[PDB]
Structures are given as C-alpha cells and as structure tokens.
C-alpha cells in the first residue's frame, strides 16, 4: 500500500538518467562559435576560420 | 618561384587566400613555410604601347 519506501534505488536510477540526459543535451551549445552544427560552419566559410 | 602580376593582385599571394589568381594560376598551401617578395617594375615592364 504505502509507496516511497524505496527512495535509494529510485534515486540512483534518477541520478544516472539525469546525468546521461544532460550529457546528451550539451550537444546543442554554441561555446562562442558561430553555430552549434558542424555542417553549417563547413558549408559557409573557407577553412582558415 | 618567380613571376610578374598586376599591382592589385599582390594581396592574393597568401596562405588560405582566394580570388581569381589564387585559384586558377598559383595556389599556396595552407601550412606554407617560406615567404614572399614583391616589388614594382612599372618603369621597366610597362610600355606606352
């Protein structure tokens, strides 16, 4: 009947899932470059920059 | 390597440079080592005809 008695295992699962999800999410950042996708940078500039 | 070109095109002799001469007549490598010498021969290589 009573739930929330298994906090530790659920916490471990949530931590792993959140870490993996944010690692995946980081791909969309810019890091100060012109764009966040390689193809746009390649297909809009000569290699010097 | 020696040649004679027009006055305006001297800026096209550089690594990673583009234009009309750098892509059709003489292309320099991106990692070029060595260097370039240029001077003016108007009173010698230019004729009234």
From Swiss-Prot, chain B:
Sequence segments annotated as region (Integrin-binding motif): 6-8
Domain of life where this protein originates: Viruses
Oligomeric form and interacting partners: Binds to host ACE2. RBD also interacts with the N-linked glycan on 'Asn-90' of ACE2. Cleavage of S generates a polybasic C-terminal sequence on S1 that binds to host Neuropilin-1 (NRP1) and Neuropilin-2 (NRP2) receptors. Interacts with host integrin alpha-5/beta-1 (ITGA5:ITGB1) and with ACE2 in complex with integrin alpha-5/beta-1 (ITGA5:ITGB1). May interact via cytoplasmic c-terminus with M protein. May interact (via N-terminus) with host bilirubin and biliverdin, thereby preventing antibody binding to the SARS-CoV-2 spike NTD via an allosteric mechanism.
Function: Attaches the virion to the cell membrane by interacting with host receptor, initiating the infection. The major receptor is host ACE2. When S2/S2' has been cleaved, binding to the receptor triggers direct fusion at the cell membrane. When S2/S2' has not been cleaved, binding to the receptor results in internalization of the virus by endocytosis using host TFRC and GRM2 and leading to fusion of the virion membrane with the host endosomal membrane. Alternatively, may use NRP1/NRP2 and integrin as entry receptors.
Protein name: Spike protein S1
Source organism (scientific name): Severe acute respiratory syndrome coronavirus 2
Portion of the parent chain present: 398 to 446 of 1273
């Amino acid at each position: 009947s009573t739930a929330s008695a298994l906090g530790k295992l659920q916490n471990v699962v949530n931590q792993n899932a959140q870490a993996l999800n944010t690692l995946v999410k980081q791909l969309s950042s810019n890091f100060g470059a012109i764009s966040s996708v390689l193809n746009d940078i390649l297909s809009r500039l000569d290699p010097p920059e | 390597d020696s040649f004679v070109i027009r006055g305006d095109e001297v800026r096209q002799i550089a690594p990673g440079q583009t234009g009309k001469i750098a892509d059709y007549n003489y292309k320099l490598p991106d990692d070029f080592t060595g260097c370039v010498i240029a001077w003016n021969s108007n009173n010698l290589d230019s004729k009234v005809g």
